[PDB]
Amino acid sequence: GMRRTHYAGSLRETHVGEEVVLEGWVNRRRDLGGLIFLDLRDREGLVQLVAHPASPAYATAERVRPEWVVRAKGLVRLRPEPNPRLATGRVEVELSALEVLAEAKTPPFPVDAGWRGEEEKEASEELRLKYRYLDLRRRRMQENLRLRHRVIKAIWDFLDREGFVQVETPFLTKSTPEGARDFLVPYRHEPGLFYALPQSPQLFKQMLMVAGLDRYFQIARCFRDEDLRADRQPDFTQLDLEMSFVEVEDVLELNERLMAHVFREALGVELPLPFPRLSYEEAMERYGSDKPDLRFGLELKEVGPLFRQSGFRVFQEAESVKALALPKALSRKEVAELEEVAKRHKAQGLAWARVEEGGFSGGVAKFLEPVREALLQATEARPGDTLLFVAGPRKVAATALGAVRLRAADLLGLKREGFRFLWVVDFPLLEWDEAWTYMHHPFTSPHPEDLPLLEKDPGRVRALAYDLVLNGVEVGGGSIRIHDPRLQARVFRLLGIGEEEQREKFGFFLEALEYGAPPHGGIAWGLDRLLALMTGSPSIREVIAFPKNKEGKDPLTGAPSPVPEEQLRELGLMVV
Amino acid sequence: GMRRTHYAGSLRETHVGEEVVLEGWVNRRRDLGGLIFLDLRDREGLVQLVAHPASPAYATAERVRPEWVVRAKGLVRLRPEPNPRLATGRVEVELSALEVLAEAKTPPFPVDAGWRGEEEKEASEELRLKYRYLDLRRRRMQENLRLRHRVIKAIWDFLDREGFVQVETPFLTKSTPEGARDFLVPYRHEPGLFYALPQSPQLFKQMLMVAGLDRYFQIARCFRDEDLRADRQPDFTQLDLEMSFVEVEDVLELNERLMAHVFREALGVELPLPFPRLSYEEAMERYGSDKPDLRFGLELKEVGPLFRQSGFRVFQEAESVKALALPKALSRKEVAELEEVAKRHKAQGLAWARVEEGGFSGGVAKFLEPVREALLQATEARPGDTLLFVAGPRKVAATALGAVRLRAADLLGLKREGFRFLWVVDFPLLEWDEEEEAWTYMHHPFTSPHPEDLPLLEKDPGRVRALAYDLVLNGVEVGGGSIRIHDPRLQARVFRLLGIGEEEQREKFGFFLEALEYGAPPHGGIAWGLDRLLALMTGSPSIREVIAFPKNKEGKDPLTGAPSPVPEEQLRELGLMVVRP
Ligand SMILES: Nc1ncnc2c1ncn2[C@@H]1O[C@H](COS(=O)(=O)NC(=O)[C@@H](N)CC(=O)O)[C@@H](O)[C@H]1O
Ligand SMILES: Nc1ncnc2c1ncn2[C@@H]1O[C@H](COS(=O)(=O)NC(=O)[C@@H](N)CC(=O)O)[C@@H](O)[C@H]1O
């Protein structure tokens, strides 16, 4: 069997009197009063080893250095005084034996402090990625990775109970000139032919519904050669799922219970069900964003129809006027800060006014007095508040003041805590291109109520699509799919997408619909983004074991790197 | 919630009297005396629907064709005569409503037979792949993928219980060597730069032991550009795992318990523990193969010294001869078949001879009668058998006859049953190629030599044992692994022996070698071939039967048309062009 009797960090007072054998890394050494104290570290935490002058281990204990790997043997004793910052804090190990298994160079950054419950100084992320195997020794990184394990196991447990079948889908598949750019893989035996990495399992998982598997899931790797962001890697992980014979309601309710199960089991957090839902239109109107942050209020209010008889032409003639009431008298600097946030979001400007006991003061206060009663009933502003207004096209005014609202939260120091999920539903199927564009993929079903509006009034057609939002971040997205090939053809005909282009991009899938596809729909979570939010991480790199840096490269291995020209000649390709 | 009240295949006589809502595919339609009988299919199986002329459902039922998708409502009744071939066979649904959710044209091959409990005609595999989404409707294919699901879930339950941390490793990286070519990915922003797809997560899981995670696993996708074979796909799946502070035995016992759990939970099969073990030497000495098939006997016997003083120079001069006593009298055409498979395995020839009541019968029975009493004691070949022989070097003799042994099982109709696992252990650090007569290495260069053999690394490399092990099932390699090198000095020492200078060390493994200098713990691990295991668990002829959307035997994808060209514009954006012949 194993030589170690316990994980080092698992020793408690219940083990006093036992002889133990431990293996781990030297976190830190301390010489105090002729005793040698060694913090022994493994993944379950630190335990204090003590070498006494009489002990056979005494000389060895004096020469060991941080990060050396050792095997220790001794007796579990109570500490004279416990250290409550360690779960092993009541006990220590009186060393009888100490053996060196590997020496270690001094690491380029410290990894010992987190294991003592001390704050850790921020290190260069580029240095952390270069020595990622050392960065992953830190307690916070192991907690992230172990939480990610617990989340995926919880997903498996739940979806297996609900009758879902995990199916693994191809990584080498068809290159399509649609969507984001594909990562390509050269096919050695016929130069000029390429596989592509999958942007998502979408077509495969729909084909699994055509195959009658009823319900599917996969922890799926997705590859998109696009520009990067703090929650955006060249390859990332989705929880991908698809069900048959469902309506929007069935997909949402399943995902709510799954998410509640995940948070309960992996974080010990209780999520109230059901999640709140807002139409896309409601979200834009009340928050100015299709991914609202519900951790604070400060909703936007449409006050356009209060100023149709006003002398203030910029309010009076505007298509929309959005108002926001902040519970604090702002600095003129702060107002100008918010004005700049509004202008950066296409707004013509940001009007403002202070609310007093009997009226308004400053900014556009003069033009607000005539409608004071209605303006206060619509905004519910109180004496002391600041009123912020953006006037213009309806979508511009909403989005500008929604960004202003987000910035206002920071400038007011609002405590934003917990996990606030919501569904955004009833997205528009289409959007005009300065033609007609869709959101994500063209297999999203139109609302059956809106079918006649496809050709008569396309911009008003609702899709059966939904986004899952957590604390103002898009953690998931899906839809009910088109399963009638005659309706899919009708959507393509409306999109101007010719039959030759359909067969080139989607021919094998469109043929599949001719053999009886069931009603079906699904979703994919951004699993890295969820875990980042679950851990309060500033970037999804904190929840990926070996990510790329924010520039798409890997400082650890050096990829991407050149290859010998003989390796590239074998593929029949050459650098231009 | 769902309109559906039950899965179609789940209805039983206990449901008689209930009104049900079902959704699924029309497996078959039969018309009889005005009634319309629809076998409704979903993933749980078939149930008969009955549409009566008087029903509101009837007009719709008249339109329905095979593979149409319908929603059905009605009352469960007993059938006047049950169908004992069906789980729902005692009952039927008297339809009150029927709605078509999707029409369907006739499939290019039938999917209905297996749901009825009837044998299925073999269809062209290239056609099944072009329409894989229809092929996956068959009961057999669904059984395979749901078994694949249960195996992975069982793996997660066991290893999570044992404290392993699942960690996902990169696919756009620099690759570890496992014996194949790398699949490359052009880096768009600087032509001439490439990613590699990982042949395995080898170096990442070792770095995870450097990171102190103690024990890791991953259901890992691996990518290898190598020659085609029905047991290998260009991209395939491993159960990959690694452990810290372990010896060989620790890794072997954990894997035995894991495999026993998988078979119990997914197949209801008990596997006796522990698995038998054979050294690499003992495996080939007795079976002429490092992946022995233990489902039958016919072991190889060493008859070397019994020819030191005879006239047959082939048997006297050879480094070894071995014998196999097939309990039957082979035909002259059968011995030619075995000779072909023997000579195909670089054998000098297949010496043969029957055995009668006291003497022999032809072949090399001339040089065989001199030692009829001594050799018969070794082989124990009752009269009526045949005796096959190979003469030559040690490795060539066993391998050639061991290959004949395997063919003999097929030509003799041996009933080989069940699941026979074994560990093959104590592989040499180097394996000698016969053709290229050079020192290859089977397992990757991070495999640790046996610590007692470290002085032989410089004095006598071919005597060095490796701390490696292969898991074998029914003559098939389902897993392989080793204890690794954690000392940076020793790892460089083993690189320089394998023909890798300091320059190549830094370029290919510099980052990993430096990691070893920060306190790497003892570690070791293994990886299963998950597709291979599943193919064996289902009795499938190839791993394509247990992969949802595999490539064909030629490595292409007929469902989607991959691999395919890409526009000239997309190609030049990568700063690459195809070389002209
Ligand atoms: N580069 C990136 N890095 C990290 N996370 C990312 C990401 N790009 C997207 N995500 C995350 O992946 C989620 C799903 O991806 S997706 O929105 O592109 N949709 C779909 O894929 C459909 N097929 C699913 C369906 O329709 O069933 C997003 O909401 C993000 O959280
Ligand atoms: N092309 C292919 N298709 C399908 N299955 C395959 C295959 N190539 C290999 N396998 C299967 O994958 C298993 C493991 O792969 S391997 O032997 O290359 N070893 C290792 O990888 C070490 N790193 C593990 C370690 O040392 O920890 C083999 O036993 C086969 O069953």
Short mmCIF file of N, CA, C and O in Angstrom, two decimals, chain B residues 33 61 105 122 124 168 176 301 317 352 369 455 476 532:
data_model
loop_
_atom_site.label_atom_id
_atom_site.label_comp_id
_atom_site.label_asym_id
_atom_site.label_seq_id
_atom_site.Cartn_x
_atom_site.Cartn_y
_atom_site.Cartn_z
N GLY B 33 -58.15 -4.30 -42.05
CA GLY B 33 -59.57 -4.20 -41.79
C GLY B 33 -60.07 -2.82 -41.39
O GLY B 33 -61.06 -2.71 -40.66
N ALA B 61 -53.82 9.74 -38.83
CA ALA B 61 -53.10 8.47 -38.92
C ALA B 61 -53.00 7.97 -40.36
O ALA B 61 -52.02 7.30 -40.71
N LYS B 105 -38.81 11.51 -45.20
CA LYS B 105 -38.72 10.67 -46.37
C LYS B 105 -38.06 9.34 -45.99
O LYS B 105 -37.50 9.19 -44.90
N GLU B 122 -26.56 -6.44 -42.39
CA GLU B 122 -25.38 -5.60 -42.44
C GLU B 122 -25.51 -4.60 -43.57
O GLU B 122 -25.68 -4.98 -44.73
N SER B 124 -23.82 -1.13 -45.61
CA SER B 124 -22.53 -0.53 -45.94
C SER B 124 -22.11 0.48 -44.88
O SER B 124 -22.86 1.43 -44.59
N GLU B 168 -8.95 19.62 -16.74
CA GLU B 168 -8.96 19.70 -18.19
C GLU B 168 -7.71 20.41 -18.67
O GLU B 168 -7.36 21.48 -18.15
N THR B 176 3.29 16.29 -26.55
CA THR B 176 4.08 15.23 -25.96
C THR B 176 4.21 14.07 -26.94
O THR B 176 3.29 13.81 -27.72
N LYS B 301 6.05 -23.81 -25.88
CA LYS B 301 7.02 -24.56 -25.11
C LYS B 301 8.40 -24.41 -25.75
O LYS B 301 8.53 -24.53 -26.97
N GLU B 317 21.27 -25.01 -35.12
CA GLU B 317 21.98 -23.74 -35.18
C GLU B 317 21.17 -22.59 -34.60
O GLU B 317 21.75 -21.59 -34.17
N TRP B 352 6.15 -28.75 -39.35
CA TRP B 352 4.94 -29.40 -38.88
C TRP B 352 5.13 -30.90 -38.84
O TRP B 352 6.03 -31.46 -39.47
N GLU B 369 11.39 -38.07 -34.68
CA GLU B 369 11.37 -39.38 -34.03
C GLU B 369 12.56 -39.66 -33.12
O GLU B 369 12.39 -40.42 -32.16
N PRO B 455 22.92 2.04 -12.55
CA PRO B 455 24.29 1.86 -13.05
C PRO B 455 24.38 1.17 -14.40
O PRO B 455 25.40 1.32 -15.09
N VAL B 476 -5.80 -7.59 -26.26
CA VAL B 476 -5.84 -6.22 -26.76
C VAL B 476 -5.25 -5.30 -25.70
O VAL B 476 -5.56 -5.43 -24.51
N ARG B 532 -11.32 1.68 -27.13
CA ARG B 532 -10.93 0.28 -27.25
C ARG B 532 -11.64 -0.57 -26.20
O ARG B 532 -12.20 -1.62 -26.51
#
